[PDB]
Every structure is written in structure tokens, then in C-alpha cells.
Amino acid sequence: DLGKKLLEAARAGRDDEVRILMANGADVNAADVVGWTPLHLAAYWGHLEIVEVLLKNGADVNAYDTLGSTPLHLAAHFGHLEIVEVLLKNGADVNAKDDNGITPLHLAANRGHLEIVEVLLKYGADVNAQDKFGKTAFDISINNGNEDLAEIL
Amino acid sequence: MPNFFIDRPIFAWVIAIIIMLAGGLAILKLPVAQYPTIAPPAVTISASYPGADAKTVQDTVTQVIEQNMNGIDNLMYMSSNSDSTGTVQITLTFESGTDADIAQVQVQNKLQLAMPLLPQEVQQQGVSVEKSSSSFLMVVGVINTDGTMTQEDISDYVAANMKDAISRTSGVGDVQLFGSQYAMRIWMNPNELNKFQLTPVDVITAIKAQNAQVAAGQLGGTPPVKGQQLNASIIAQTRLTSTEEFGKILLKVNQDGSRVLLRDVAKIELGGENYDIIAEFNGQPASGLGIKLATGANALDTAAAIRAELAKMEPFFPSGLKIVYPYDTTPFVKISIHEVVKTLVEAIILVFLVMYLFLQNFRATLIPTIAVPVVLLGTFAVLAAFGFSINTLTMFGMVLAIGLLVDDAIVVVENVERVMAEEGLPPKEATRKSMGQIQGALVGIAMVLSAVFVPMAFFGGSTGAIYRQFSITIVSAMALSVLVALILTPALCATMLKPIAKGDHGEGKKGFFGWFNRMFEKSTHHYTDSVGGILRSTGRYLVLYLIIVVGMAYLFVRLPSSFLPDEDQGVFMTMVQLPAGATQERTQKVLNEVTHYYLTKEKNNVESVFAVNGFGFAPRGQNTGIAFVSLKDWADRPGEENKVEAITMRATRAFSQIKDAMVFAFNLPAIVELGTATGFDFELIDQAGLGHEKLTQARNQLLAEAAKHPDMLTSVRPNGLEDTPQFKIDIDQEKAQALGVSINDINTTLGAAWGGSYVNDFIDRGRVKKVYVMSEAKYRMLPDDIGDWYVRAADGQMVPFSAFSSSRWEYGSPRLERYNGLPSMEILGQAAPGKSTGEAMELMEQLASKLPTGVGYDWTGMSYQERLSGNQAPSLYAISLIVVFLCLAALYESWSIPFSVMLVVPLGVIGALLAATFRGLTNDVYFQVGLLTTIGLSAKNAILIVEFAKDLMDKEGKGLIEATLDAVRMRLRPILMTSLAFILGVSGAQNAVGTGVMGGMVTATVLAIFFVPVFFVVVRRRF
Amino acid sequence: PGADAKTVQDTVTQVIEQNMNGIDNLMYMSSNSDSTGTVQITLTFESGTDADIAQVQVQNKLQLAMPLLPQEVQQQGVSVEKSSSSFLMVVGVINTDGTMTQEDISDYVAANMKDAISRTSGVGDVQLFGSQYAMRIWMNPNELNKFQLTPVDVITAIKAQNAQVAAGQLGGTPPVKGQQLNASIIAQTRLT
Amino acid sequence: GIKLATGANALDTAAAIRAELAKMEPFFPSGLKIVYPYDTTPFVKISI
Amino acid sequence: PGADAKTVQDTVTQVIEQNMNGIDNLMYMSSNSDSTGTVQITLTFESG
Amino acid sequence: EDTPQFKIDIDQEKAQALGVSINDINTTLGAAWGGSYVNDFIDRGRVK
Amino acid sequence: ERLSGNQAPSLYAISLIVVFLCLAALYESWSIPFSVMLVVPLGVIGAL
Amino acid sequence: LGTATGFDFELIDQAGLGHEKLTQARNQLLAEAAKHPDMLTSVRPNGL
Ligand SMILES: CO[C@H]1/C=C/O[C@@]2(C)Oc3c(C)c(O)c4c(O)c(c(C=O)c(O)c4c3C2=O)NC(=O)/C(C)=C/C=C\[C@H](C)[C@H](O)[C@@H](C)[C@@H](O)[C@@H](C)[C@H](OC(C)=O)[C@@H]1C
Ligand SMILES: CO[C@H]1/C=C/O[C@@]2(C)Oc3c(C)c(O)c4c(O)c(c(C=O)c(O)c4c3C2=O)NC(=O)/C(C)=C\C=C\[C@H](C)[C@H](O)[C@@H](C)[C@@H](O)[C@@H](C)[C@H](OC(C)=O)[C@@H]1C
Ligand SMILES: CCCCCCCCCCCCCCCCCCCC(=O)O[C@H](COC(=O)CCCCCCCCCCCCCC)COP(=O)(O)OCCN
Ligand SMILES: CCCCCCCCCCCCCCCCCCCC(=O)O[C@H](COC(=O)CCCCCCCCCCCCCC)COP(=O)(O)OCCN
Ligand SMILES: CCCCCCCCCCCCO[C@@H]1O[C@H](CO)[C@@H](O[C@H]2O[C@H](CO)[C@@H](O)[C@H](O)[C@H]2O)[C@H](O)[C@H]1O
Ligand SMILES: CCCCCCCCCCCCO[C@@H]1O[C@H](CO)[C@@H](O[C@H]2O[C@H](CO)[C@@H](O)[C@H](O)[C@H]2O)[C@H](O)[C@H]1O
Ligand SMILES: CCCCCCCCCCCCO[C@@H]1O[C@H](CO)[C@@H](O[C@H]2O[C@H](CO)[C@@H](O)[C@H](O)[C@H]2O)[C@H](O)[C@H]1O
Ligand SMILES: CCCCCC
């Protein structure tokens, strides 16, 4: 009811509406057909305030979609440094693997978010973590030809 | 000229016959349609890409086509859609007056040169270039009642049997099949394919090989060996013609010598090309034909011919098949024509009654009864000459015109009857003098009425196209009325009318007519006594006039504005919108709930519900559906409660209960091709390669600002879809190359299985049709089924898809919009109650300027039309007034006197505004032309009052007040006679037409007879 | 692209010229085949000829020749235009700041300005004084031979890896009964 | 280098080009600027 | 090329002829499907 | 009048068993009896 | 040929009406036209 | 319409002589035109 309204508000970035919905008691575990909670969407679209507001209102930080991807995966992949930090502070699994064995470090390394990679390493990201193809964040950096990223890993 | 034909009544009769024959000939040869070509010429480039997403379609097809749409003449703008149904529709709208054939061939030609740049799959499917128009003559629905046929089974029959016959039918333009004919569906099994070490690539290779037309050659072909006895054509492979033949398509032979056929690894059946659209007519499987009217064709004859041909097909139809007509414009054109002929006859009947009531002789009552038909027939001839058609706009233009034709008839005859009654002249001499008095004014009235109606024909775009229909009709009818009034009706008066003795006002008569003459002679004396008192105290009445002009101006603005109103057309849609990721099974259940509702609760009003799943106005995703609700006759649905407006709100109100569905009913626009509903059509454009996501943010930012102005903007929404979750799959090139699996074989397996691959053509019962390889439903449903598909490596091992793939969820557009070859987002909205669209647009421009850098905007459709046409209005009002003034100046030989006539304008208008205000009507086109005809007839009255008044002062040397009182006296009877004919008498358009006059006349008649003499005296005294 | 005057003439110009027949009000025809790879066949018509129909007729014949032309020539896009030989005007574009180079300016005009001007009614032909950007793969024969690869392999890889794939949908039509999810399948997209 | 279509009006076409360029100028990058180094239409306007 | 009249008629002539609806001033339409492979669909229009 | 047609049937299985592709069969048959337009050549400076 | 013959009657009909009406207007009579138009058969038999 | 005195001549290969032969023919014609300054002035090829 209000869960399908929160999912739209979280995606759009309507801070005021999410706040009003949190007061009315909108379900923060309300997901779409792929299993994306409002935190997933807020993390994907880079809505920092909503991410903070949702976590305050008892949202699952380690919630996973039907392919095992958590909000930190999305935040790390789409270069939302502030959200990545907020999620990790609220106890986000930094070494979380999706169904492909891919981690937030792999995704951040791929798109080349050097700042985010450093934040993930700070909170204890397994640099030697391999995907289903046996490839690390280092193996990505050399393939992409990222000199700065290659040095860090 | 009157003098000429008074002495030559046979000539006058010959001209009348030539006009009647020309008119009678025109009526038969004239086209017939509901509405003419109003919308500007639009050419839509349609294409299909099986299994392609919005972006794949856009970035391979749409952009390539859009880049190659140069060197095309008279193009105003270009809009394109690219959605996840694998569809692209590029609409190119052209300048009004462009040759639609030349426009299309230029678009067609530039596309054909861009075809080698499109994908092979799109080239194979083909790109359609058609004249963009949803103005169907009728929709012929084909249904199966006994449930023996599916939607596929019906569509195939309609295509193979009916479609070509409806195409052949006399007066039929374009025929669209509501569905696809059969296709050879190969439903592959990945468990079977993997078992025999095969892929969809092998299935496609085998179908391409074993289902083909092979050129062999000839026996004894030239150059031959001299002495050859026979020359025969050689036949090798031809196309397959059965599911059996396709079954035996040999894929592989094993070591033991066993045959692996196509039937072993795939299910094979005659299915449909498309499964995205599910159409139902009251819950029963249905197809249909979208018939259009051909250029210069008769809608009534075409519709009859279509039904006549469908009747000859009745015997050949399969068991359970029925023909239905959910949409038909034919009944409207019948009424439009019928209600003109009704008014035409009622007018003639009422004139006769009033003519006899006052003049009291049958010989006089026949002069209008001849004149009016002659002019009306003449109008039909002039419409044919200028290339116009019999339609609503031209027909209701004639209804309004009849008022002017009736006046010209009464005016000429009454003036002869008076001149005879007052002087005692013989009819022939009386007509000479009578015409001598009015002949100058009649010519003047023609130029004034020309100066009123002609200018609105020079409006630009859609608005001008509509006004042109009324303008030419009324000007033609009016122009011929004056010609007939100067040629025929004088000659009739001089020959048919009987001598009246000098001073015989029929007061010496007995009975009703004896009483009436004494009664009316009193009323005429009391009238002149009243006007006598009015002209003593003019200043007071000039204050009462300014109260009316203030009242008019105020009551004009407060009345709601429109072009063509939303009327009960016996049809209305019901949009069914499920959330992102919803399937067609979920959508169908809501469509069933919508269908059930209308057939249960609205059984009295609703005839049928055409429930189309996976459709809007174009093909949409599984999560969308529309229901075309067809109502019963208006005779079966009495009361305002059982009209679309109330039925719509009741339906929308009841469907607020439905969970996980935005279900709402809405009425059809009068002309859909424009979609004009008051408001605007705003385009938000990416001008700096910002991307889709950045354009979405800017749109949300604009929608937010618009929502903070309810006082100015109302219902400001996007005409687009929000980003939906989509299944991203990444093929590892390293793991593919390492295992010896080619990416072509990988992308083909995925594309063919999950998306469907159009392989080649086969021949089903003498008709060429498409062959489609695709995965059987249950193996291409969920992401877990990805790994069930195997691709053969170079070494011969079968590698599963999970081995060299890695999938994740992301968000992407299910429908990407572009405007003028730039990424856009269409935004609809309207002005708030008591606000103009011009104001609302000016705010949208203001709000749009505060959006991020690189985000531009533009106006399209009705906005573009209203933007340009609105700027012309002041220039046309100026010419209209300036020329009206100049015409009267030449008539009265005075710069001052014309004002006395022109001051009548508000007296005609005020009545219609009061009538419209209290009945709660809108300022629609029908009403606006209604005001022009009310003003015209009001001016006509005043023109003859002033002419008579000025003539008495000039010729007979009478005083200002004497001449005025003597003039208004002479002109009282003919003004009341015309006015009485309306009072006796003489369906939303019918209201706008009738009420655009009735209220006007009831007041205008009373106001004019008292105020015209004031204007003349006041103006004459001033100058 | 990369053809000499004769290759161009013998594989395109002649093939097109031979199909130009039964065209109304044609005075004469002149063609130029040059070593840039460019063909230009001008068909001059009688004074009073409808340029719209002249274009329609000329292209009707070209479309018969189109399939006989090389795939490289078709994929470059053949253009039929009914314009003056001289220039109406020249719309110059400079960068006063000097932030953008001659190549950067040409690309912008091509990508952001040219198309809209080419669609404008009255504009018979637009000619970019420059070139729109392309993904230039500048091959090294020393490095190609080293790893035992050819321009053939380079072209095979690009078409295969820089692909835009139509991969279908999850819960697509016709679906199984009880399907709850419907989502577009996104495989390979064009490299950016 | 814009070339006039056969029969098309030079002044009318030139006016439409300037109108379309006027819609582009606002969204130019920093530094980019239009210049008119060759136009045959001004002579027609002035000489008339 | 190398297609009998029937194959030619079903795959070409029928497909073209069925799309020859909505053409102004069409008196009649005659077509030949030959064993050479050739099709010739002639559309004769109203005089004028 | 109806003409005689020499219908030659290619056994798809028998060909696959012997290891001959039907592309080579269809081309050999097609090119031999019917003729095959391969490409153009220049005869005294003209495309033929 | 069929068209030529099928429209010939209505051609003669309107041709007579027009000539009749033209005489009626010119000579301001209904008798002169009728007295004249009766001559037509005397000519037509000659041509036949 | 061209220039006042100017003419536009086209030398044609009628018998399929080739480019080299047509060049010789052109070079010869240009030389003969150069020997008549009294009649012809600036006779040159419009090519490369
Ligand atoms: C004014 O016009 C109306 C009817 C014309 O009558 C018809 C017969 O003619 C149509 C024309 C010429 C269109 O252009 C349409 C259109 O673009 C549609 C839809 C819808 O399906 C339509 O339904 C039409 C449509 C008609 O039925 N939008 C789409 O498909 C898309 C991509 C819609 C996206 C979002 C929503 C769902 C949509 O924006 C909604 C919020 C409203 O704006 C419309 C439903 C309007 O209804 C109203 C006034 O509430 C119609 C345009
Ligand atoms: C009489 O004509 C003149 C103006 C036409 O007015 C214009 C607007 O219309 C033109 C047309 C319809 C052409 O066909 C041209 C042409 O073919 C040219 C050149 C050359 O740029 C042109 O310039 C035009 C040209 C025009 O400017 N030749 C070439 O490009 C090639 C491939 C080679 C050039 C060879 C030499 C160098 C050239 O022949 C030269 C010797 C002169 O003969 C010309 C430059 C003429 O200059 C004058 C004033 O003597 C013009 C043709
Ligand atoms: C497609 C558009 C259609 C265009 C149609 C154009 C047709 C052209 C017609 C040309 C008319 C000729 C010029 C007028 C004639 C005047 C001189 C006639 C000789 C003469 O002595 O004058 C009298 C005329 O009457 C007078 O004193 C004046 C009256 C003149 C009568 C004019 C007759 C024209 C009839 C045309 C019919 C078509 C109508 C379509 C609008 C003769 O006659 P009379 O007095 O001796 O009489 C018989 C009494 N016993
Ligand atoms: C292709 C197929 C199409 C088929 C469609 C139908 C075609 C319609 C064709 C129209 C034919 C015209 C018919 C004319 C009617 C003539 C009436 C006879 C009059 C008559 O003989 O009396 C005259 C006196 O008339 C008088 O008393 C004076 C005249 C006043 C009365 C005139 C009334 C005419 C009414 C016409 C209505 C026709 C409607 C048709 C739609 C005598 O002669 P005279 O004494 O004058 O001559 C000598 C002067 N010294
Ligand atoms: C001063 C000069 C008047 C002298 C003549 C006056 C009377 C004429 C007598 C004629 C004999 C019949 O008398 C006539 O009957 C008709 C009936 O149609 C009536 O005429 C009228 O009378 C009634 C009222 O009584 C009206 O409502 C009605 O409109 C009408 O019927 C009159 O009563 C009379 O005008
Ligand atoms: C609400 C809708 C708009 C209302 C429009 C009203 C206009 C139509 C009604 C006009 C009726 C005319 O009524 C007429 O009025 C004038 C005064 O104004 C009267 O005249 C009166 O004033 C004059 C001037 O001082 C005196 O000389 C005269 O003796 C006296 O009777 C007439 O005797 C009367 O017949
Ligand atoms: C470009 C459009 C310009 C026209 C616009 C003006 C339209 C108004 C037309 C005015 C109506 C005619 O005006 C009226 O005509 C009649 C004849 O019919 C004139 O009367 C005239 O009759 C005849 C015929 O012309 C003359 O020989 C005679 O000298 C004169 O008395 C009147 O003196 C005049 O007042
Ligand atoms: C005065 C003669 C008028 C004739 C018009 C037909």
C-alpha cells in the first residue's frame, strides 16, 4: 500500500514524501519484483538523505536482491562515496558476494571509483576476493588499464 | 440588375434551374465524411526488432533513421518512440497545405537509402512508412463465440479471406489488420538440443537450408544443341507448406545411423507472429479491420459497401465467427446530414406560416419556398467547385446560414407588399421601387458579411482548416442569397404578387387575420411611440448600452474556452496500468474485472468492451492494457446520468478500489488526430548529451515546480514510462575464447531462444508467411533457466550459459522519447480553472528556464498550433473591422454613419453569452461562428434601418428623428417575421449551434429595434 | 572509402549511370569519379521540371542499381539531392576562449547543429567544413604480426565485442501460466 | 556550407537557418560562437 | 530468378497487390506472374 | 497452356551421409543448367 | 468503349436541356425554345 | 547562365578508346585552339 509508494519516493529522491511515509509507517522491507528495497533504490540513484532516513527507520543494510546484490554493491558500483560510508557505518557486509561471487570492491574497481575503493579497504575489503571467473579487483584494474587503482590494490 | 430580371422573369428562372441542376449534380458527386482533413500532414516510420529493448532499438535503428531524414521539404518537427516491445515509431509532422503524397515519398526515399545502416533483423522485418492518422471510417471487429478459434486463428482468416475484399470495396482507403496472420512457430527444447549436441544456430542453419526456393535452371535452354525437341523449366527445392515438413527438417545423423529431426528438439505449430497483444470482445477471442475512408469518397456509400461485401463473405465464415462494429462514424454523418434537411424543411414550413400570418396570401409564401432551396443547392455547387466535402463543419455552417437565406427572402417580398400597401402601385412597378430602395444595401450587406466571415479562413494550421469549412460555406450561401435576391426573387415578386389598394393594411378584414392586422398596427404605433420616448432621453440608454458592453466583455471571459467539445460519441477508453515488472496474465485479470464491471453494472448503456492487453494507443509492455467500451444508441440511454461524462466518472470511481492497478476511464477527443482537449503539449529536450538519467532529474524538477502552482497549472504529468528493473547479462569474452565458444554462437543462442529469431518465409495454403524459432515458454521465463542453455565449443563439448556469463539487476527506460533527433520527454498539462492556456504556457517557459544547463524545451501538437494561430487573431480582427467599416462608408457615403451599424455587435452577442452562461455551455467553434451569424443578421437589420433613415433625410428631406421613426416603423414587420421564424423553432454540436443563436436572437431582436435608432440619432448629432 | 578513381567509376558510377533511363525532362547527365572514393552524378532537367518528381524518378532508378553496388558504398549512405551547385551561405563556428580545437569544434557542429540544419525546409544540401568523430583504431603492423593477428581479426573482434544484442525478455510472450516477473534482458551494448 | 534546394526562397530559407541556430546558441559550450563569413542573402535584402 | 508462376504469384504478386489499396483514381489493376520469374502489376488510372 | 516442369529432388539425408553440402549441390545444379551471374567485368571500357 | 456508350444518353439529355434553357433566357420565351427544340429529331434521323 | 564570352565544351569517347587515347585527343585539341588566338582565348581542361 504505502510500501509501493515508498519504493517510488526512494527511487525519485522525494526526501519530504519518504519522511512523511516513515511517520505513517511505510514498510521499509517493501521490495519490487527483483527484490530491491527502498534502500537498494536510494543507494542506486544516489539519494543520501533517504539512505540515512531509511536506516534510521529499521531498514535492512545487508538486504539482497534475487541475484544476491546488496545496497553497498549498487552504491559502490555507481560512485556514491557518501552513501557507501553511511552503509558501512550502519554495519554493511563489505565482503558481501552476489550470485556471481562479485563484491562491492570488484564493482567500484570496474567503474574506477578510487575514493570508494579506499573506503571499502579501510572497512576491511578482501583485496584477494575472486569472482566466479577467479578474477580480483586487481585483475580488473590491469584489464581496464587504471594506473592509480592498480597501485592501491 | 433587379430591373433587368423584373422584365425578364424567364431568364431569372433559367439561372435558378442552372443553379438547381449544378447543386443537384454537386450533391451526388460531393464527398461525405464526419470531419475533413484538419490536422497537418504526418508520416509515421514504423519498424519491429523482435526481442530488442528500448535502447537497442534507439541506438541501432531510431537514431540512424533520424540522422537520414534530411532534404525533406515543409517539415515542422519530428518525434520518435523507442520501447522494450522492440518497436520504433518516428512521426514527421509537415506544414499545413503540404502534399501528403510528396511528403511521404520524400520520407520513404531517404529511409530506403538508410536501410543498409539498420540491423539485418530490422531490414528483414521491414520499416513501414504510412500517412499518420487514427481517423478511421469504422473498426470491423471479427470475434469467435463458440471458442473454436484463438485470436491467431481469427486474424489469419481475416487476412487471407476478408482483408483483400474490404481493400477492393468501393470508397475504402486504408485497411489495418488488428493482429498478425499465422507464422511457423518452432518452440525449441534446450534439454533435447543439449542431448544431441545442438544449438538454435544449428536449427536456424537447417531451416535456412531445407526451407528455401532454389533456382535450378532449364532443360534445352538457350544456347541449345540445334535439334533439341523440348525446353522445360527445372524445379529443385521449394518452400515447405506444413508443420509436418518442418518437423522432418534433418539437424544431425548419429554414429548408430539414427536421424535427429526438428520435431525431436522442438514443438512445431501454426501460431502468431506476435503474442504481446491479447485482444478480446466481451471476453471472447477477437481480431478486427481498421478501415479508413479514401480521398473524396462518400462515407455513407463506403460503409454500406463494406457491410454489403461482409454479407457476401457470411456464407464462407468458419463456425462461431461473427462480425461486430464497436466503432463507426457513419451514424454521425447520417444525423449531421438528416438534421440539416430537417432544419431546411422546418425553416421553409415556418417561413410559410409567418409569411401567411402577416402578408395573408399564399402567392407570397411560395417566393421564399423557391428562393431558399435554390440558394442551398447553389451552396452545394460552390462547395464542389472549391473542392470541399459534406461534413459536420460545412453542414452546421449551412444550418447557421439558413437564417441569412430566410431573411433575404422575407426582406425582398415584405418590402414589395409594404410599397404596394402604402402607395397602391401595381406589383411590377411596386417591385421596381421596392428593389430600388434595398438593392444598394443588399450588395453592401454582402461585402460586410464577406468582411466578417472571409478573414477567419486565413487562420493558420488546424484552427484555420476548421474555420475554412464554416467561412466558405456561409460566405457562399450568403453571396448566392444576395444574387438570388437581386435576380430571381424580384422577378417572382413582380409576376406572382397581387395588387394591394393604397391604405389597405387588412384592418377591414374579419376573423383572426382581421384582428391580427388591427392588433399589429396598434403594436407598430406603440413601438414608434416607445422609440419616440427613447430618442428624447438618448444619454440614459447610452449608459444602459455601456452596462451591456461591460456585461458582454465580463460574461465573455468568464465563459470557459474550447475548439471542439468532448461529446458523447458512443465510445470511451479505460486505461489499465499495472506496476513495473507485471505480466500480461496479471493485466488480463484486471481487464476481465473492467470488462465484467461494464457488462454487469452498465448493461443498460454498454454494448461491448474491446479489451486489448499489452496496448495503449501503440503496442505497450505486458503491464499495460486498454478497453475500448462501445455504448448502445442515445435512444436507449436517456438522461445526462447515462452519457460518457457520468459513465466515465462512475467507472473511474469504482476502479479506485482495484489494488496494484491505475485503472481510469476517459472520453475520446472529437478529432483524435490533433488530441486538442485545451491545455499544452510540452517537450523537455537534452541539448548537451546529458543522458536519460539527467533528463529524468530535470523532468522531476519541472514537475515539482508545476505542482507548486495549482492556481496556474493543473494535471502536469509526463506522457512517458518510468525506468523499470531489467536483467543485465555479461558474457565473459576470456572464458568464451578459452573454452572455444564463439560470441556469435552465444549471442545467437540467447537472442533466438529468449528473444525469438525470424528465420525465413514458408507458404501456408498459397500465402507466404514468417518462420520463427524461439524457446518453449517454460525454458525462457526466470534467470535460473539461463544456465539450462548450452553452446557447442570448437572441440565439440556443450558449455552451459552459467559457465561464461554473470548477471545482475539494473534500471533502464522501457520507452525512450526523442524530439527533433534529440533525447526528449513529452509533458502534458492544462491551465487551472479561470486561466487561459497562453498564461499557463508562459509559466511553463518560466519554470523551464530554471532547469539545469543543457536542458532545453519546445512546444508540439496543439501547443505549436495554438502558439502560431493565436498570433494571427489580432491581425484578422483588425482587417475584419477595418473592411466592414470601409464597406458601410461607401454604402452610406459617410465616415460617421458606419459606427451607428457597427455599434449593434454587442446586442447580438450578449443574448448568446447569457444563454451559454446559464445553460453552462463552452465557447466552442460552433458557438463562435454562431455569434458571427447572430452579429451578421443583427448588422443586416441595422443596415436597412440606417439606409431607410438616411435615404428619407437625403431624398425626401425629412428630419433626423422623423426619418428614424419612419424607418424603424417600415423595418419592424420584416425583422419580427425573421425573428418569429426562430422563436417557433428552425446532440452537443446541435446545442452549441442552436444556443449559439437562440439566446442571441431572443434579446438581439428586442435590443436592436430600440437601440439601432439611438445609435443613428446619437452618431448623426455627434458628426 | 580507399578506392581509386577507376575502381569507383567501374563498380559504382557506370552501374548507376546504366540504370538512369526513362527519366522525364532530362537535358543531360555528367558524373565525376575521383581517387577520394567520391562519385557525383549531376542530372540536369528542363526549366519548369518539378524538382520533387525529378528527385523521385532519379532515386526510383538508383534503387535498382543500389543492390549491384559494393556493401562498403551502400553502408556509407548514397544521397539523392535536388539543390543549387553554389552555396546559399556559410555558417562558421569558432571557439573564442580556445578551449576546443578545430577537430573538437567540427565534431560538435556535426553532432549538435548539422542534422537540425539539414532537416530545415529549403536546405537542399549541408556540407560540414570538418568531420564528425569516429572510434579511430590506429593499427600497428609490428604488434599485429607479433601476436600473429591481422586487420581481419581486429574487424572480427570489434563487430563481435562492440555489438548491440536483442536478447529478449524474462517472462516474455507467450508466457507460462503463473509467471509473476517480466523484465527486459540486456546483453552486450555499444562501446562508448 | 548550406546549399539552397531547387525552387526554394533564399531569404526565407536563410531566415529559417538563423531561427534554428538561435535555438542552439544557448546550449553551446564555453567559448563556442557562430560567425557569418559568407552570405549571399544580405545583398538581396539591401539591394531590394 | 528460377521460380515458377505459382511460387512468384504467392511470394511476390499477392504480397504487392494486397498493399495496392488506398490509391486515388484507380480504374482497375491487372498483373502477370510468369514461369520466367517476372511479375508486372499494371495500375490504370482515371483519364485526367 | 500448362508447361512441363522437370522436378529434381535432392535427398537431404543421402547427401549428408556422403558428406556433400546442399549449398554446393544447389550451386552446381543452379549454375550448370540455369547459369550464374558471378560479378561484372570491363569490356572496352564498359561494365558487363 | 462501354464507358463512351453508357454516358452518351445523359450527354445528349443535358446538351438538349442546356441549349433549350439558353434559348429561353436569350429570347425571353418558353414557346420559341420548345418550337425550336422539336426540330432536333428531323436532323438526328438524317445522321442515322 | 554562365559568363558572357565563355563556352562549355565536352570531348566524348564514342568508340571505347580508353582514358590514355582520350587524353591524347584532348591535348591535340588544346594545342590547335592555342594556334587560333584571333577566335579562341583561354581554352583549358576543367579536370586533373
Ligand atoms: C488527452 O488524450 C488522452 C486520450 C486520447 O485518446 C486516444 C484514443 O488518442 C490517444 C493519443 C493521440 C495519444 O497520443 C495517447 C498517448 O500518447 C498515450 C495514451 C495512453 O496510453 C493514450 O491513451 C493516447 C491516446 C488515446 O487513448 N500515452 C501512452 O501510451 C503513454 C506512454 C502513457 C504514459 C503515461 C500515462 C498513461 C498517460 O500520459 C496518461 C497520464 C494521460 O496523459 C493519457 C491517458 C491521456 O488521457 C487523459 C486525458 O487522461 C490521453 C493522451
Ligand atoms: C567558368 O567557370 C568558372 C566558375 C564557375 O562557377 C562556379 C561556382 O560553378 C562551377 C562549376 C559549375 C564547376 O563545374 C566548376 C568546376 O568544374 C571546377 C572549378 C574549379 O575550382 C570550379 O570553380 C567550378 C565552378 C565554380 O566555381 N573544376 C574543378 O573543381 C576541378 C576538378 C579542377 C579544376 C581545374 C581548373 C583549375 C579549372 O577548370 C580552372 C582552369 C577554371 O576553368 C575554373 C576555376 C573556372 O574559373 C574561371 C573564372 O575561369 C570556373 C569553372
Ligand atoms: C461556364 C460559365 C457559363 C458562361 C455562360 C456565358 C454565355 C454567353 C452568352 C452570350 C450572350 C450574348 C450577349 C447578349 C445579347 C444581346 C444582343 C442580342 C440581340 C438583340 O437584339 O438583343 C435582344 C436581347 O434582349 C435584350 O434587350 C437584352 C437581354 C439579353 C439576354 C441575354 C441572354 C443570355 C443567356 C445566357 C444563358 C446562360 C446563363 C448562365 C449564367 C434580343 O432578344 P429579344 O429582346 O429580341 O427577344 C425576343 C423577343 N421576341
Ligand atoms: C440528365 C437528367 C436530368 C433530369 C433532371 C431534371 C431536368 C430539369 C430540366 C428543366 C426544364 C425546364 C422546364 C421549363 C418549364 C416551362 C413551363 C411552361 C410554360 C409555358 O409554356 O407557358 C408560357 C407562359 O409562361 C408564363 O406564364 C410565364 C412564366 C412564369 C412561370 C415559369 C415557371 C417555371 C418553373 C420551372 C421549375 C423547374 C424546376 C426544375 C428543377 C408560354 O410561353 P410564352 O407565352 O412565355 O412565350 C411567348 C411569349 N410571347
Ligand atoms: C373598429 C373596427 C373594428 C370592426 C370589426 C371588429 C370585429 C370584427 C367582427 C368579425 C366577426 C368575427 O369576430 C372575430 O372573431 C375572431 C375569431 O377568430 C376573434 O379574434 C380574436 O379574438 C380573441 C379574443 O376574443 C383572441 O384571443 C384571438 O387572438 C382571436 O380569436 C375576434 O372575436 C373577432 O375579431
Ligand atoms: C435586463 C436586460 C436589458 C434591458 C434592456 C431594456 C431596453 C428595452 C426596453 C425599452 C422600452 C422602451 O420604453 C420607453 O422608455 C422611455 C424612457 O426610457 C419612455 O419615455 C419616458 O421618458 C421620456 C424622456 O423623459 C419622456 O419624454 C416620456 O414621456 C416618458 O414616457 C417611453 O415612454 C417608453 O416607451
Ligand atoms: C473593392 C471593393 C470595393 C467595393 C466596396 C463597397 C461596397 C458597398 C457598395 C455600395 C452599394 C451600392 O451603392 C449604391 O448603388 C446604387 C446602384 O446600385 C447607386 O445608384 C446608381 O445607380 C446607377 C447604377 O450604378 C447609376 O447609373 C446612377 O447614377 C446611381 O443612381 C447608389 O447611388 C449607391 O448608393
Ligand atoms: C444589367 C444586365 C445584368 C445582367 C447580368 C446577368
Author numbering:
A (entry chain D): 13 to 165
B (entry chain B): 1 to 986, 997 to 1033
C (entry chain A): 50 to 241
D (entry chain A): 290 to 337
E (entry chain C): 50 to 97
F (entry chain C): 722 to 769
G (entry chain C): 866 to 913
H (entry chain A): 674 to 721
Copy out sentences from the published article reporting this entry, exactly as the authors wrote them.
AcrB is the homotrimeric IM proton-motive force-driven H+/drug antiporter component which recognizes and actively transports multiple drugs (antibiotics, detergents, dyes, and solvents) via the tightly connected AcrA and TolC channels across the OM, leading to an observable resistance phenotype. Four different entry channels (CH1–CH4) have been described with putative entrances from the periplasm or the outer leaflet of the IM toward the two drug-binding pockets, the access pocket (AP) and deep binding pocket (DBP) inside the AcrB pump. Here, we present 13 X-ray structures of AcrB in intermediate states of the transport cycle.
Our susceptibility tests and a co-crystal AcrB/3-formylrifamycin SV (3-FOR) structure show that other ansamycins (rifampicin derivatives) are also substrates for AcrB. The interaction of the drug with the short glycine-rich switch loop mediates the accommodation of 3-FOR inside the AP. In an attempt to prevent ansamycin binding, we made the switch loop more rigid by Gly619 and/or Gly621 to Pro substitutions. Surprisingly, the crystal structure of these variants showed propensity to bind either 3-FOR to both L protomer AP and the smaller AP in the T protomer in the same AcrB trimer or two rifabutin (RFB) molecules to the AP of the T protomer. We assume that the Gly619Pro and Gly621Pro substitutions induce a switch loop conformation mimicking a transition state during wild-type L to T conformer conversion while the HMW drug is bound to the AP. The intermediate positions of the ansamycins observed in these structures appears to precede the binding to the DBP as has been shown for erythromycin in the MtrD homolog RND pump from Neisseria gonorrhoeae.
